[PDB]
Amino acid sequence: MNPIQKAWLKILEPVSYVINEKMAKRTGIIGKLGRFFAIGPREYGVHPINRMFIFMNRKYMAFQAVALHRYSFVKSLTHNGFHMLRVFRHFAFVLPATVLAGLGLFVYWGDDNKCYSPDRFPYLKKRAGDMALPLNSLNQRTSAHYIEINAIYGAEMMKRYHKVWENIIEERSKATDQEKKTRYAHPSYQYSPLPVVSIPNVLNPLNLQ
């Protein structure tokens, strides 16, 4: 039992009443269904994962005490405390340093947690859908400056083209059929008027600005 199981019971108090008091004691399939989904304390409700941590925590911690509980290398240098000849005194702080580094075991796990991964090749294979790429893919690249600067450049110039596009359509509206068919036309073209028909001059077919 734990607090989280007790919270479920308070929430499932009415459900426990329906299934246990009414259904569980009925005959037929309604009873088999209630006795099967009966609410209470858990049969085999232990959590092996939580129990696994407790075991490995206690076993690894006893190792820490042995590795960390060492006689000092510094105190053995004066030959006045407990150590005259210690030819392996320079190994005293190897296991302690090794245990202290274990604090970073999970903080630094895998390649991405030891470097800036976007600058490494594996990151690319992940962004391509876990797809194999040539090893020189990090070099054959287009400038990120161009892609973002050109996207702004193109849009800023379209705003200025929209204004110019309006003045041209306006000035062309005040032009005769003769001019709008001879200006910018091929020299070999002989103009021949067309029958006048009604064709509106709508800038944007959709009612947009």
Ligand X SMILES: COC1=C(OC)C(=O)C(C/C=C(\C)CC/C=C(\C)CC/C=C(\C)CC/C=C(\C)CC/C=C(\C)CC/C=C(/C)CC/C=C(\C)CCC=C(C)C)=C(C)C1=O
Residues near a second copy (CB under 8 A) are: 170, 173-174, 196-198, 200-201, 207
Binding mask 61-90 for ligand X (x = CB under 6 A): x--x--------------------------
**Using CB under 6 A, which of 103, 132, 152, 155 touches ligand X?**
103
Among residues 2, 5, 57, 72, the one that binds ligand CDL under rule CB under 6 A: 72
Smaller CB separation from a second copy, 139 or 201: 201
Q: Report which DSSP code applies to 194.
A: P
Contact 70, 93 (CB under 8 A): yes
Is there a contact between 135 and 121 (Cβ–Cβ < 8 Å)?
yes
Binding flag, residue 90, ligand CDL (CB under 6 A): yes
Longest CA–CA separation in the chain, Å:
121
- Residue list for the binding site for ubiquinone-8: 57, 64
Nearest 5°: phi and psi at 133?
-130, 155
CA gap 93, 101 in Å, rounded: 12
**DSSP SS3 for 206:** coil
Residues near ligand X (CB under 6 A) are: 4, 49, 53, 56-57, 60-61, 64, 102-103, 105
